[PDB]
Curated annotation (Swiss-Prot), chains A, B:
Record bears the keyword Glycosyltransferase: yes
Protein name (Swiss-Prot/TrEMBL): Glucosyl-3-phosphoglycerate synthase
Organism the protein comes from: Mycobacterium bovis (strain ATCC BAA-935 / AF2122/97)
Gene behind the chain: gpgS
Catalytic activity: an NDP-alpha-D-glucose + (2R)-3-phosphoglycerate = (2R)-2-O-(alpha-D-glucopyranosyl)-3-phospho-glycerate + a ribonucleoside 5'-diphosphate + H(+); (2R)-3-phosphoglycerate + UDP-alpha-D-glucose = (2R)-2-O-(alpha-D-glucopyranosyl)-3-phospho-glycerate + UDP + H(+); ADP-alpha-D-glucose + (2R)-3-phosphoglycerate = (2R)-2-O-(alpha-D-glucopyranosyl)-3-phospho-glycerate + ADP + H(+); GDP-D-glucose + (2R)-3-phosphoglycerate = (2R)-2-O-(alpha-D-glucopyranosyl)-3-phospho-glycerate + GDP + H(+)
Subunit structure: Homotrimer.
Source species taxonomy: Bacteria, Bacillati, Actinomycetota, Actinomycetes, Mycobacteriales
Length: 277, 277
């Protein structure tokens, strides 16, 4: 049903490069306070630059640590959200950063890799672009690998409301690649909703045959607090309900620490980047 | 908004007993393979029997361990699902057990306490019945206390679709009490959907003023596997969407262990026990 590559792809980098056929490739690393891991991520990919990869940027999303200086010292082009699109005031969240990154790149193909990876494989990018390069009509490639939000919230909600996407193992995965034509044609959900939004919109518009998923081997759970997962789940839900035509209250999740706190949720997507042309 | 008792209730057992005023109290312990903890739970409550508590049963939900013999050796009346209602074939899941327990009790008030508690407080039952006994119009009392499904799935979904219930700290809590009149008037969701179903139905029919929540002090996370949480979340979602008028696919969550497995979900509620009269 869904083109799934279960084992190590066999394509060599030179085959893949040859297969580009004039198409270009941009790589985007969104980054918010990832000073510990950003350089390792950049280094895993920079040997591809001027070859398979035509372009690499770090999309810095307001870091106040050493993310930017360290990315620069690893030879990466670093682009702030403001620089990506300076006529338009910056909103918080991941989705804003990824959407803005479209204005700061020009590749026919765009690859996203999270900047929080601990020793990422140097073949992530080649493995992700394979189906886009080699085939016809694949426009989106998702990764999978051996989380709580994914397995308790997103996958069960998909089974409930878009069971056709039940075969996708990591719908929330931060590692994926897509054609510019697709990406600039889709709205971008705010915050942590962006991946699930892109997947449902992609499916609704082109169906499964435009989607592939590739095995990246092994990944281990980021350690983050429960409360951040709470807010994340809320935004994933808001984005998922909206794509399925269901009205969301717009009310943020409240949590009680013995004290009460309400986290922000957003029901506002960014429009297709195409309108900004 | 929602009557919440944040500290230790001050009512003494003799006040509470006096406040019954001819009303009776049943206690139900649903149990599936809880041989390690069932006796401690029964013992925490049996000193109340023939006083505040008029009736205690263990609703045995198909145990194949020593649950039943150990409950009997602690002086509990043990009722199988079949015995609770023998003309009607037994379905799997928690909701079936709780629903059936209504036919095996006759208290004006029914208290549910999970049978998997590690050293439960002997005041759980007095604390839960307090608002039902002392006041007017409270028909349902939920507990709260210092889980993943609760905080990632149920609370965020309530915020999305029934934000009025956002102030409920433990919507999925297995410890609660209610009037028979209320309980026999509501359908019972299958599986792990039963608590969330009772809460939403209660709210929709009587509003918040009929609902209270009481502090039980401290509770610690049951250790159960992620996959069981996956199936649990799916059923909670199915029950929640249905109460909110949203169609659920009826498709079970699938998980990939490198091998694939699909877990059951049910879109079938039991009707109000009243129709069985
Ligand atoms: O407003 C944001 C939030 C996240 N990210 C980036 O998106 C990626 C995934 O975010 P996540 O919160 O999952 O990673 P974490 O913060 O736990 O390291 C990270 O590399 C972040 O640096 C970002 O650029 N802007
Ligand atoms: O089909 C079921 C499932 C659960 N329970 C009871 O409902 C309570 C809560 O179930 P849960 O799965 O949360 O507890 P666990 O199995 O982890 O001990 C337990 O005491 C169970 O014995 C039951 O009677 N029948």
């Amino acid at each position: 049903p869904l083109d799934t590559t279960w084992h190590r792809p066999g394509w060599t980098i030179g085959e893949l490069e040859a297969a580009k056929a004039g198409r270009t490739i941009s790589v985007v690393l969104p980054a918010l306070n990832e000073e510990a891991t950003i350089e390792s991520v950049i280094d895993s990919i920079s040997p591809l630059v001027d070859g398979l990869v035509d372009e690499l940027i770090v999309l810095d999303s307001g870091s106040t640590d050493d993310t930017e200086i360290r990315a620069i010292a690893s030879g990466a082009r670093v682009v702030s959200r403001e620089q990506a699109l300076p006529e338009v005031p910056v909103r918080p969240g991941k989705g804003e950063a990824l959407w803005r990154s479209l204005a700061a790149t020009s590749g026919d193909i765009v690859v996203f890799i999270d900047s929080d990876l601990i020793n990422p494989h140097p073949l992530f990018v080649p493995w992700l672009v394979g189906p886009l390069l080699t085939g016809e009509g694949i426009q989106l490639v998702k990764s999978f690998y051996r989380g709580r939000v994914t397995e308790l919230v997103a996958r069960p909600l998909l089974a409930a409301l878009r069971p056709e996407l039940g075969c996708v193992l990591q719908p929330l995965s931060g590692e994926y690649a897509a054609s510019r034509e697709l990406l600039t044609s889709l709205p971008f959900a705010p915050g942590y909703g962006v991946e699930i939004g892109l997947l449902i919109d992609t499916f609704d518009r082109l169906g499964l045959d435009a989607i592939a998923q590739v095995n990246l081997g092994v990944r281990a759970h980021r350690n983050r607090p429960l409360d951040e997962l709470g807010a994340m789940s809320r935004q994933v839900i808001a984005t998922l309900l909206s794509r399925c035509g269901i009205p969301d209250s717009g009310v943020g999740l409240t949590q009680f620490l013995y004290t009460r706190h309400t986290w922000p949720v957003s029901l506002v997507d960014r429009p297709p980047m195409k309108v900004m042309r």
